[PDB]
Amino acid sequence: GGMTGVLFSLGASMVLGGVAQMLAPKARTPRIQTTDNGKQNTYFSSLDNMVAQGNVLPVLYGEMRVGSRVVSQEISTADEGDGGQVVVIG
């Protein structure tokens, strides 16, 4: 137990994947679909309304106009009324 044989140095065994990978951990590209055609969406953009069923609530960090997750949509009859008494319908 005094000695520690089999030092087993690791050099190119970790370089073999690439050198910038051992300084920066790289990024994950999304999966490409077919019905989506060629619109390569990323993981930090959403310009359409989503559905909030058993999903997570997204967060925003700066600028970059985004869509939303619809929680309630309803149509009723538009009653006549303003912020006052002027209610002419002639």
């Binding site: 137990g1 005094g2 030092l7 050099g11 050198v19 051992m22 300084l23």
Partner: protein, 49 residues
């Protein structure tokens, strides 16, 4: 050759100080540590780029 003269040495070196000699027009080799390994034989394994 073996002996040398330093203009102003500091009297703190005992026996085990290590001298490093730097000339001009020499590209000194820098080196950054990433992976460090321990072992019970009391030494370290450094993997660096």
């Amino acid at each position: 050759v073996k002996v040398k003269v330093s203009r102003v040495p500091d009297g703190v070196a005992e026996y085990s100080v290590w001298e490093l000699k730097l000339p001009t027009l020499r590209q000194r080799l820098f080196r950054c540590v990433s992976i460090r390994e321990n072992d019970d034989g009391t030494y370290a394994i450094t993997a660096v780029q």
